Structure formats: structure tokens, C-alpha cells
Design a protein around this ligand. Structure first.
Ligand SMILES: Cc1cc2nc3c(=O)[nH]c(=O)nc-3n(C[C@H](O)[C@H](O)[C@H](O)COP(=O)(O)O)c2cc1C
Ligand SMILES: Cc1cc2nc3c(=O)[nH]c(=O)nc-3n(C[C@H](O)[C@H](O)[C@H](O)COP(=O)(O)O)c2cc1C
Ligand SMILES: Cc1cc2nc3c(=O)[nH]c(=O)nc-3n(C[C@H](O)[C@H](O)[C@H](O)COP(=O)(O)O)c2cc1C
Ligand SMILES: Cc1cc2nc3c(=O)[nH]c(=O)nc-3n(C[C@H](O)[C@H](O)[C@H](O)COP(=O)(O)O)c2cc1C
Ligand SMILES: O=C([O-])c1nnsc1Sc1ccc(Cl)cc1
Ligand SMILES: O=C([O-])c1nnsc1Sc1ccc(Cl)cc1
Ligand SMILES: O=C([O-])c1nnsc1Sc1ccc(Cl)cc1
Ligand SMILES: O=C([O-])c1nnsc1Sc1ccc(Cl)cc1
Lengths: 334, 334, 334, 334
């Protein structure tokens, strides 16, 4: 297969409508789902010519840890619905490639099983502050023990988003909105973030910030990064594309913490634009799932290599031999 | 049924083309009809994270009177064409929900019958200043006697709008433009508003203002609110979407009177954007009619509950525990 | 028939493709043809409420002469291809309605025959400065003798525009680009306009100006008006919609001469927007031809009455009792 | 055939999908391919009236050499795939017309064979700085010996662009990305341009610059022109349309060297807009290939004459008797 969009159409075939719709969906009318993609098109590239691009180096670092490319795997729940191997395939592919994986909450594999499947792979844990604070506490402890290098706290889901396709055909695995309400605490504030900060010395990244002020607030509370994310357009519909908010957030943080982006990344040029606008790395969600549905582990590895090569070429044609050379002048919005 | 747009398609089935077309239509080319919806999409949401949203309270007040949500039923004529119960179903549903209903002119039920059907429901009367001033005078007196809490004077209809579908297949119930010309006085000015002001101490709201200067003029003449309305895009085609004019009107009124909006509200996020831009409450027109055509009273109650829950979720995901927390920074226009 | 767009589809039926295509076409890719219509949609209306609109008066004046409405018939060549009566039907309909007609060059009726068919109708002559100056001279003399009240000099056609459909199927009546090259002088400058000015004391209007500087130049050379026109999008494709250039031209002329508009007028609201932006009257081209193809004289009269009533309603709903009340604040561009 | 777009559809018929797709393609999603065309539509024309346009003269000069029109043939590889005569047909047609041809790298004809086929035709050579510097050196020497009047150095291809259709069906003539990597040196910098400058006293034009700073840098290094080009949208997708970047480049160069444009030119009005924005001449790529596929030499000659006449008419209708009269005020962007 040639590009990421071919993988989605192949996953559509191999997967039951019920399950493909769950992975594909955005919230309500899917205005933001469409805009995550479209916004990248509105950012035009202004490449520099005649720079030595012979040995294009894609390596960078995420929160102190080296990675082979600024493209890492984002947290998506219930990966075993896409392929029998699920999270284990994902993490093994990340290991092959030298990139990191964010293990999702409601993963279809344990934190321990993931660690063992990819012992040398870079691993981070995505987590919610649950009603039962002890559950959050145990997860953090387990992540520390099992060699996970960061905690991503998702802050944009006091309740689960209203995804129309999920209701039209009811859904379950051994609706979804009720399970979230029982477990995830809608009352949480910056005080509950102070608690999480004292709970661990691991780098914590606030996942799902879309506002400048909230970003400054994250910095003030001693967190170590912002993942600019609209939760794959699955939460509040009508929020801007994450590539559009990224500038405001990059500027608000004033270089004090690393800023990352997910939502809409499907091409090498997407990666380049995000890094030009100031993101340190990007995360992909759906593309990994589509890879998984096609060929499990080899599917994920293929998806990440297609993105890797596309990013290498896009870097080369922009006159960027390494990631440190990328700058704001490479992009301008129409 | 899941969302408001499903109700319209169901009403299309159950209703004769002649009658569905009457409820659906805008004026001339329906440019504004389309824009009432589309404009909401152009207003993007910038939600705050990590605010306590455990006990989301949707209650507010309209012209001194408490309501359960900032979503109230707008005036639409001839509701018995949609369902045998018409206005009686509508008002009973509003009573169940704790919201208000604007009784329309040319209602298929009397002011007295409506009052009795929903004695404890919040009720307002929509009215025109008719040629025969006594007819207007009696209606006002009746509204005072029957427990109606406000008068909405529609000021945007000196003549009836040209709705193409209404002419293509002639229309009637025991064309429409002739009945309006006989009854509604096209000569009326702010002097006729001075008259209406002295006529009653009930709160009067100017319904159908689209200009800043006209809004200031309404304030100057001692009226108690502005309903920013383009009459469901049924009057002058080529006027802006009401969500677009709302800022100019909110600013022109300088907090001296409450400002409301109708036209295009179909989703919880619509409600949120209107309130963010400064409206106190919104009115829905067509959605109530579609509810009525589907299941009469239960249909209207369902429509309003779908909107209610959608607004609750949208509020929660924006970090708004109550309506007093909503502010201008929640929205920015593309 | 209800609106102007219904007339075009009826004319499509009754006319041979060859002849309908000639009347319909724009130049090259028809970018401007589309934009003449579309631009009107981008101008939004901001109506005033509660102004006495009981006796809406549509009468105004064109170059000193009273007319019943600011909607007049523009010059279109070869009207007998659409209906046996051609120009005679057109002028008789204008007489019925109390509006003016611009007789076209290459009319399928003589200046004398037109004058006799509508003796009391307001008549102007459209003219080119031909290579043979005597032909232009005779036409001017004839127009003076036959009671024509103005000369419209078309200045945007040194050569005929390239209309793709006209070449695909060759065309003729007892190609077209060769006849223009033989007759119309491509060398003409403002000096040839000085000549035309001294030739007659009739009001002369420069037809087809699209630039501010050219408009000032027309004023300087003692002409009496500007018809802002892109020749029905038939000349240079990729020029702006005439409703877009009208502001720049209205401002450049500084109230020294009357300014008119044609191109794209199909609805009453079009007329209103043009007058709001400062035009004194508008001309319609194609709609008259479509009227003619449907019912000859009654067809033209119907077309003009539909426009008349639509303009009356649009005026009323904007709060304009007469044309003198229309002002720039009625419109704002998106 | 009437216009350039008819030629593409005819070439689609006569050519195998494999070969048509190679000539047609852009890079990745073809965002820029579409925008090269679309951007011209966004530049509107503001024609002057009543200027003597009797003897419209289209002649100008490219790098000191007279040409019959500001429309020249751009470099496209492997022209014999389109027609048995290939480059020989192209150059003979340019000779007939009095315009120049840029001979492409990977031409299906030798530099010597081209020179002989069109001895009196204006000829320039397009070239890459190859890994083997001697190959570049020989080409330059040969171009000097064989009467070529300029060297166009393509600077936007350190690696070949990723054209999806080329991979879907593999391609070859007695994939393509491997041949480029073996031959074209991705390491080259402005120092390798200094080398090329000392290598010849022929005018050198930097082909494929899209940035203002890079243009200034080209000027500083003693080059003689900039060809504003995005390589027919075949390299980095998501770069602006060349007509959009042309202003920034024209201004950055401050009249010190001639600036040219290719990419998207299909109509006479395109040529006019490019020259209005400050380009001295434009190059066409694909249209020549489509001409070639239809009727070889007569096909190319037809294509160039259609463009020539369309440009003549567009010039005339703008009030431009010659190319020296074209100015920035003729265009404004929407
Ligand atoms: C199938 C699905 C499940 C997801 N599950 C989670 C989750 O459990 N926790 C979380 O923080 N984000 C979750 N996300 C959001 C992703 O972390 C990420 O923000 C999003 O997928 C990025 O957008 P993309 O899919 O266009 O790459 C999920 C997204 C999808 C598509
Ligand atoms: C069927 C129909 C009848 C209406 N009748 C009246 C009316 O009698 N008086 C009035 O002031 N507005 C009337 N309106 C306008 C509504 O009060 C309200 O402005 C509009 O419906 C809001 O737009 P919406 O339908 O998109 O919610 C009517 C609208 C419709 C659709
Ligand atoms: C069929 C056709 C013939 C025309 N003939 C002339 C003409 O002879 N002289 C002239 O100045 N304009 C001519 N025009 C342009 C019209 O005067 C007028 O500018 C144009 O029709 C207005 O645009 P509209 O058709 O959208 O109303 C012609 C237009 C059309 C459609
Ligand atoms: C078939 C094809 C082959 C091309 N080969 C070359 C080439 O060998 N060297 C080069 O500098 N540009 C090459 N180009 C780019 C052209 O020189 C030119 O930039 C482009 O075709 C202009 O865009 P247009 O096709 O829309 O006119 C090629 C373009 C195409 C379509
Ligand atoms: O966007 C998404 O799909 C999600 N984000 N956080 S949980 C989630 S899906 C989900 C999976 C399992 C359970 Cl129990 C509840 C919810
Ligand atoms: O938009 C609308 O449908 C309306 N607005 N005011 S009356 C109305 S419809 C109407 C109903 C009944 C009569 Cl008698 C006249 C008109
Ligand atoms: O737009 C148009 O159709 C026109 N404008 N001026 S003449 C014309 S059409 C025409 C009619 C007759 C002759 Cl002989 C030449 C040309
Ligand atoms: O856009 C294009 O098609 C191109 N630009 N430079 S070479 C080229 S195509 C090509 C032809 C032949 C060989 Cl060997 C390699 C590449």
C-alpha cells in the first residue's frame, strides 16, 4: 500500500461496520473531524533551495528521550478489536522503528504485558484522574515500575463525547458513555493536577489543551509539556483544528515546555508543518489502527515507515538536513 | 431518534409536501435559510479544561422569570397542521421541561385554550400591531388576564415575505400574502411602539431587529429586550445569519436589556455559541414543528430534551458548570 | 412563471441550442459570468424596522427623465432571433411599464421602427464609434431626430470577446468576430470621445467602464454618466463582478455624474443592493431576451413586473418608502 | 481544437494511461497541481478603456534575445513518449512562432540533434548539477558550442518528488526516483552555484525558486534571472501556486534580474496576469506535451498559436498595445 488513506479503505473492508465506525467517528456533526485534515491544506510550505540535504537526519527527542523521528504513536483504546495482537503489535513496531508509544487507558492489554512485549521501546502512559483516586495512583506506580518514561494526563474528557454512529448501533467488548461516567471524575480541577504532580517525578504532559491560558496554567503547575489535541475530534465538536491552535499555544508557553500535536496527521508534510509551527513531535491515532487492521504488527510498521519516508522527503525538499533547521518561515497560512 | 435533523426527515414523510414546504421554506432563493445554519459552523469553540463540571446547572431566567434552560419555544403559526393537538401539545411539553413558549399569532388555538392546557408553563405572546388597533389592544388585555408574562412584537413584517414554494402549490387552512396585507399595518413606526408601551406594563420584546441602531432605538423607547431574528429566513432574503448580527446588537444595547436569538438553532453547541456571544436565551422554531409532526406532545418533549442534553454536554466540555460562567472568549469566528 | 430563472429554462426549451448559447454565453471559461450572479449573494442586507412603508414609491429618474422604477432594459443585439417581434415587443413593454429601453447596435429593427412602436416610451441608443465615422454620425443624428434621450457609447469592445460556444457551432443571421473587426474601430481613444461630445448635446453615457481612473476621465471629458458594465461577462473574462467594482466607481465620480449598473441583475434584492451602493438605476440584459422567447411582448412585460414587485417588497422590508431613502448602510460585504 | 483544455482530453485518448498519468501528475495529494490553475482565477483584471489598440504588438525579449511573445516552451523530459518526433517537433514549432524552447534534461533527443532541427530557433538548456560534475561541465560546453543562449539550473530537486500514479503502475523507457538519486547530487549548495557561475559567461537562470530570500541570494551570486516555478507541482506538494509567490519574488529582486513564471498557464489571460505582476515571460509545460500527443509539430504550433491569439485579445481588451504598457494596476487579488 502506498499512502495512509489506502489503509483506511482496507480497514473498512476487513472490519465490521460497528467497529470501523467506532474508530473513524468524530463528535456530533464531525465538523472538527473534517477540519483536522483540511487545516493542514491551508498551511502552505515555502521551501529553501540549495542547502546540503545529503544525509537527512530525522532523529529528535521527546521529553529528554531520543527517538528516530518526530512521529510517535498516540493513545487509542481497545486495539484488539482491530487485530488479535493489539497493543503488543503496536509496541513491537515502535521498537523496530525507534519511536515511542503512548499506551492508552482502556487498553486491551495490561501495562505489564506491553512492557514485556517491547522492553526496549520508548513507552509512555496515558491516564485519566479517576473518581477512585487509588486507581490513578496504582497506574502511576505501575508505570514507574514497568519502565514507562512519562504520564500523559487527558484533561478534555470530564464526560465522553457524543459520537452519533456509536448510538445508532450499540457497542460493547469483553453504551460506552456510561462506563466513562462511572470511572472518570468530572469534578477535577487544577488542584487535582497539583496532586498528580506531587505523586510522581516522571514528566507529566497535559493532553488535550486547546487554549493559551490553560497552557500557561499547565506550565505554572509544574507540568512538562502540552499535547495540543482535540481528542481526534471525538469530544466537543466545533473546536478548531489542532494545527490552527498550535501557534497560539506554542507562543503562550514561551519555550518553557515542549509542545506536541495530534489530530489529522496523515502525511509527511503534515509532520513538517507542525514542527515548523513549533511542535517538537506529533502523534498519530487512527492511522495506527488502520495499520493494525491490515497486517497487525507489519501493518503498524508499514504505516510508520510510510510516514517516516514522506517526512524525510518533505524535509529534504524544504532544505532541512535535520529537525533543528526547521523554522517558522517554512509555513504561512492562507 | 438521535438528533434534530432526523426529526425533519421524519416530518417530511408524515406530512404532505404542501405543508412540509410551508414549514421548511425561506424567502426567494433561501440564501439566508442556509446561512442561519452555516454561520454557526464558522464560530469555533475554545473550551477551558479542568474546571469542576460535576453538577452542570442549565437554569437561567428570561425577563425576570426562571427557566430550566436557555432554550425556549419560538412562535410558529398554525401548529395544528402538523398534529391534531398543535399548540396544546407544545405548551404541555414546555411545562414538563420548565421552559417557556411564545404563542404565535395565527395560532390554531385560542389564547385561553393555551393558558388552560399549560397553566403553570411560562407563556409569552407574539403579536403584530394590526391595522385595526383594537385587535392588538384586545390581545394584550387577554394576555394580561390569562397569565402571559411578556409581549413579543414582531417588527420585521410590514408585508409577508415571498416564499417560492408557497406560490408553486397554493395553500390554505380553515394565498397567505393577502391575509397579511388586510390585517398587518405596513405604516407602523416607533410612534406605534410608544403606543404599545403605554398600553401595558408587561415586558415587551422587539422581535426581528437586525441592526445596532434599531436596537438602541428599541432601548430608547422603553422596551425590555431584543430578539435578534430574521424571521426564520422567511422575510427579506440576503440578510445575515442571526448568529452573525448578534455581536453588533449585544454591543449596541450595552447591557441595558436582555438580548435573545433565534434562527438556525439545531444543536446544543449552537445554544452555547449564542450565549457566549451574549444572548441570554435562544428560541427554536422549525424543530418544534418537526417534533410535533412525529409524536405530538412527546415529539416536542423529545426535541427539547435532545437539545437540553446536548447543551449540557457542550457546557460541560467547555468547562462551564453554569450559564453565568459562559463568556465571549469561548468563541472566535473564522 | 414565478421568477426570472424559470424564464431562462423555458427559453432553453423554445430556442435552438445555437441561439440559446449565443444569448447565454460569457467569454472563455465564464468565470465572470458566474461571478456577476454570485457577487450579489456576498452583499448582505441590513434592513431598518418600523419605518412607514405603506405607499412604497419606486419612481426615480435617469438622466433627467422620469421612470417608474430604477430597472431599465439594456442593449442586447438581434432580438428577433428570440421572437418574431423582437425590439418592437421590448419597447412596447417598456412603454406599458413606464421604464426606458436602450436600443442596441445590430438591432433587428431600425431606429425609426422602434421610435414608432413605442412613441411615448423612454428610449436611449447604444452605439459604437465605428471605423467609418459617418455611420456613427448618422446614428447620432437619427437618434436626435427620432426622440431618443441619450447616447450610450460602449467603450469595452475594441475587438469582440472570445465566446467558446459561438465557435463550436458556427452562427449567422440575415463568424461574428469578423463583422466586428470590419466595423468597430479598435484605435479609438479619449480624443474620439471629445469628438462624440461636440457631435451632440444629448446626454452621453460611457458604457463598460470598470476602473476608477477611467471614470474620472469620463467625467473630465464632459460625459453625463457611467454605466458600470462588463458587457454581460462577454468580453474580457476574469474581470470582477460589476456589483464589486460599483463602489470604487461611485466614489471616484464624487457625485458629479449618475452611475448605473448592469450584469447579474435577476432579483429585486439585486436592484436594492446596487442602489444602496450608489447606482441610480440598473439595466437587465438576458432576462429580457428570456421573456421575449417565452411570450414576446407579454413575456418582457411579465419579466419587468416580476422584478418590479420583487424590488417593491425588498424596499418595503428594508424600511424604504422611496428610492431617496436607500443608503450605503443597507449593505455590507462578506 | 478551440482551447488548451481540449488538447489534454484528446491526449488522454491517444496515450496509454501509464504515460498520460506520468505527464499529468503532481506530487502526493496534488494540492498544488490544482492551485496552480485555481490561483489565476483569484487574480482579477481591471482593464483600461479607450487606448489605441489597433496594432497590438506581442514581441518582447528574454535575457537580451528577442521573442515574438512572452510565451516560451518549458523543459519537460521524455517528449518522444508523446510523439515519435518529440523534441524535434517542439523546437521546429518554436522556430515557426519566433519563441524560445528550454531543452529539458533527460530529453529523448541530443543537444546536437535539437540544435540542427531548429538552427534559427531560440534555444536554452535546462540542467541539473549532477554528482559527476563532469557531466554538468560537458553539457554546459555543448550548449555553448551548439548555440544555446542560456542555462536554466533547476534547484528544487535534490530528490525526485513522490508522484502517486507513477508508483501504482511502474514506469520505464529505453522506478524513476532511483535514476535521479544516482545522478542528481542532493548535497549541492550556493557554493556549487558559484562554481557554475565561473564555468560559463552564458546567462544562468535559477529555476524553481519560491522564496524571496533565495531570490536575493541568486542575485547576489551573479545569476541572471529567476524562474518562479514549483516544478509543475511535481516536487513538494503544499507549496503555493507560482502566480501567488511571483509578487514576493518580483519585489525581492528589485528589478536587478528578469523574473519568469511557469506552472498553471493555460490561457491568454494567465499570461497577462503574470506579466502584470512583473514577470517578463512565462513558460508552458504540459500544454506542449498535449499538443505533441495530438499532432506532433502541428499540435505544438497550434497550442502556441491559441495561447498567442488569446494573449493578443486579452492585451487588447485591457488597453495594452504592447507589453511595455502592462502594469501592476491591471490586477488585484480577491
Ligand atoms: C479509536 C480512538 C480511541 C481513542 N482513545 C483515547 C483514549 O483512550 N485516551 C485519550 O487520551 N485519547 C484517545 N483518543 C484520541 C487520541 O489519543 C488522539 O488524540 C487522536 O487519535 C489523534 O487524532 P488522529 O486519530 O487523527 O491521529 C482516541 C482516538 C481514537 C480515534
Ligand atoms: C412555520 C413558521 C411560522 C412562523 N410564524 C411566525 C409568526 O407567526 N410570527 C413571528 O413573529 N414569527 C414567525 N416565525 C418565525 C419564528 O418565530 C422564528 O423566528 C424562526 O422560526 C426561528 O428560526 P428556526 O425555525 O430556524 O428555529 C415563523 C417561522 C416558521 C418556520
Ligand atoms: C445577447 C447579448 C447581446 C449584447 N449586445 C450588446 C451590444 O450590442 N452592445 C452593448 O453595448 N452591449 C451588449 N450586451 C451587453 C448588455 O448591454 C449588458 O451589458 C448585459 O447584458 C448585462 O448583463 P445581464 O445579461 O446579466 O443582464 C449584450 C449582452 C448579451 C447577453
Ligand atoms: C512531464 C513533466 C516533465 C518535467 N521535466 C522537467 C525536467 O526535466 N526539468 C525541470 O527543471 N523541470 C521539469 N518539469 C517542470 C517544467 O519545467 C515546468 O516547471 C512545469 O511543467 C510548468 O507547469 P505546467 O506543466 O503547468 O505548464 C517537468 C514537468 C512535467 C509536467
Ligand atoms: O475516544 C475514545 O474512544 C475514548 N477516549 N477515552 S476512552 C475512549 S473509548 C472507551 C473505551 C472503553 C470504555 Cl470502558 C469506555 C470508553
Ligand atoms: O413565517 C410565517 O409563516 C408567518 N409569520 N407571520 S404570519 C405567518 S404565516 C400565516 C399564517 C396564517 C395567515 Cl392568515 C397568514 C400568514
Ligand atoms: O455581446 C454581444 O453579443 C455583442 N456586443 N456588441 S455586438 C454583439 S453580437 C453581434 C451581433 C451582430 C454582429 Cl454583425 C456582430 C456582433
Ligand atoms: O517532473 C519530472 O518528470 C522530472 N523532472 N526532472 S527529471 C523528471 S522525470 C525523469 C525522466 C527520466 C529519468 Cl532517467 C528520471 C526522471
Amino acid at each position: 500500500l502506498i499512502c495512509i488513506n489506502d489503509y483506511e479503505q482496507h480497514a473498512k473492508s476487513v472490519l465490521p461496520k460497528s467497529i470501523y465506525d467506532y474508530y473513524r467517528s468524530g463528535a456530533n456533526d464531525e465538523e472538527t473531524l473534517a477540519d483536522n485534515i483540511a487545516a493542514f491544506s491551508r498551511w502552505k510550505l515555502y521551501p529553501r533551495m540549495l542547502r546540503n540535504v545529503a544525509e537527512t537526519d530525522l532523529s529528535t527527542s521527546v521529553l529528554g528521550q531520543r527517538v528516530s523521528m518526530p512521529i510517535c504513536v498516540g493513545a487509542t483504546a481497545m486495539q484488539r478489536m482491530a487485530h488479535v495482537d493489539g497493543e503488543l503489535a503496536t509496541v513491537r513496531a515502535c521498537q523496530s522503528l525507534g519511536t515511542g508509544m503512548m499506551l492508552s487507558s482502556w487498553a486491551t492489554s495490561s501495562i505489564e504485558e506491553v512492557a514485556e512485549a517491547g522492553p526496549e521501546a520508548l513507552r509512555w502512559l496515558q491516564l485519566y484522574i479517576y473518581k477512585d483516586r487509588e486507581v490513578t495512583k496504582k497506574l502511576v506506580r505501575q508505570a514507574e515500575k514497568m519502565g514507562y518514561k512519562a504520564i500523559f494526563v487527558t484533561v478534555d474528557t470530564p464526560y465522553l463525547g457524543n459520537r452519533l454512529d456509536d448510538v445508532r448501533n450499540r457497542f460493547k467488548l469483553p453504551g460506552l458513555a456510561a462506563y466513562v461516567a462511572k470511572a472518570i471524575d468530572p469534578s477535577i480541577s487544577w488542584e487535582d493536577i497539583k496532586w498528580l504532580r506531587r505523586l510522581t517525578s516522571l514528566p507529566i504532559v497535559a493532553k488535550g489543551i486547546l487554549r493559551g491560558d490553560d497552557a500557561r496554567e499547565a506550565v505554572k503547575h509544574g507540568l512538562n509539556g502540552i499535547l495540543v489535541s482535540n481528542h481526534g475530534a471525538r469530544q466537543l465538536d466545533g473546536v478548531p483544528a489542532t494545527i490552527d491552535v498550535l501557534p497560539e499555544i506554542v507562543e503562550a508557553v514561551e519555550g518553557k515546555v515542549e509542545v506536541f500535536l495530534d489530530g489529522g496527521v496523515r502525511k509527511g508534510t503534515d509532520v513538517l508543518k507542525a514542527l515548523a509551527l513549533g511542535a517538537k513531535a506529533v502523534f498519530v491515532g487512527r492511522p495506527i489502527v488502520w495499520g493494525l487492521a491490515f497486517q497487525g504488527e507489519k501493518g503498524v510498521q508499514d504505516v510508520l515507515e510510510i510516514l517516516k519516508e514522506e517526512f524525510r522527503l518533505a524535509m529534504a525538499l524544504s532544505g532541512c538536513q535535520n529537525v533543528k533547521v526547521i523554522d517558522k518561515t517554512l509555513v504561512r497560512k492562507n
